[PDB]
Amino acid sequence: SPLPWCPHLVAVCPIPAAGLDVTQPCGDCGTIQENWVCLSCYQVYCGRYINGHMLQHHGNSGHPLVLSYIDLSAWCYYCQAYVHHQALLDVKNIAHQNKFG
Numbered sequence: 001s002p003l004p005w006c007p008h009l010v011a012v013c014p015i016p017a018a019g020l021d022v023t024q025p026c027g028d029c030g031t032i033q034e035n036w037v038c039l040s041c042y043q044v045y046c047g048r049y050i051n052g053h054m055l056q057h058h059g060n061s062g063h064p065l066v067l068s069y070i071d072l073s074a075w076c077y078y079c080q081a082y083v084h085h086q087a088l089l090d091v092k093n094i095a096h097q098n099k100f101g
């Protein structure tokens with residue numbers, strides 16, 4: 001199981017009314033692969049196995065929680081764990097609808 005809570009959920013911000021684009025490329029390198037969306041500022045950056053731009057974004061912003069456009073899991077960089085909680089349901093559901101129809 002993911003953690004059912006973490007102390008950084010307070011930093012999850014409202015979903016833009018434009019919604020989410022799960023095909024959006026990395027804002028730095030432009031890769032289509034292994035992207036995440038930041039649940040604070042909604043910038044999109046690639047995962048550790050591509051060029052690590054989301055980890056970089058965490059480092060330079062301190063934003064805690066990011067959502068995978070592969071599997072809709074949410075990672076907290078501070079807790080170094082996956083987290084699931086009702087505060088993430090709306091954003092996960094919006095991503096699921098955009099990804100899968």
Ligand SMILES: O=C(O)Cc1nc2ccccc2s1
Binds near residue numbers: 046047048052055075
């Ligand atoms: O790729 C990323 O930037 C986010 C993630 N970092 C890790 C590190 C270890 C285990 C799972 C994850 S998910």
Ligand SMILES: [Zn+2]
Binds near residue numbers: 027030053
């Ligand atoms: Zn990148």
Ligand SMILES: [Zn+2]
Binds near residue numbers: 039040042057061063
């Ligand atoms: Zn951010």
Ligand SMILES: [Zn+2]
Binds near residue numbers: 077
């Ligand atoms: Zn956390």
